Structure 1
């Protein structure tokens, strides 16, 4: 019922504004890229991700259900979060690892 995101606390902003992104140094973030691959990652600190081209399906460990991300979104994955990240096509990604505080 509740979307999976709320349960797992991955807060997202959809279709982020250019002005908003003007703030927060969205530009100059480190970049990542992939084609078709699956990654198992456990985040030990929070990540702020501005995906752009990349599309990712996150299946929380054990789930038979997934969270799908497309276009321009900014997702803050939680500390201690463990999930599997699966992508079938081109990926772009900007990443800042925000520790406590910002």
Structure 2
């Protein structure tokens, strides 16, 4: 229900124009984030353990597309530096 994570076809990721979306990159640290609007983000390289307040972990690897919804507050444990093409909406 919260935290949509799945492994989409790579074809639709072309059509979405993900190459034209903003890159983001970060260090091997951990911090806590707040999504306040919808954000679709495709993991192109690296490893993270997100965890929600329910203590559910959501690791995402190279191949996981994610959409966080409008209003969610979770941790981000960057277990290797990651690159995710994102777009807010």
TM-score range, shorter chain: 0.7 to 0.9
Q: Which blocks of at least 5 consecutive residues in structure 2 are unaligned?
A: none
Task: State how far apart, in whole Å, the 2-side matches of 1:81 and 1:71 are.
Answer: 22
Q: CA deviation at 1:88?
A: 1.8
Q: With structure 1 as the length reference, what TM-score do the two structures score?
A: 0.77
RMSD over equivalenced CA pairs, Å: 1.5
Q: Hey, which bits of structure 1, 4+ residues long, moved more than 4 A?
A: none
> C-alpha offsets along residues 13-35 of structure 1, whole Å, 9 cap, x if unaligned?
21x32211121112111111123
Give the structure with higher Rg (CA).
1
Q: With structure 2 as the length reference, what TM-score do the two structures score?
A: 0.87
Question: What does 1:12-51 correspond to in 2, within 5 Å?
Answer: 12-14=5-7, 16-51=8-43
Q: Which blocks of at least 5 consecutive residues in structure 1 are unaligned?
A: 1-5
Residues matched between the structures, number:
89
**Could you say which structure has the higher strand fraction?**
2
> C-alpha offsets along residues 50-102 of structure 1, whole Å, 9 cap, x if unaligned?
11103211111252x4111101121000111011111121211111002xxxx
Greater RCO, 1 or 2 (C-alpha within 8 Å, sep 6+): 2
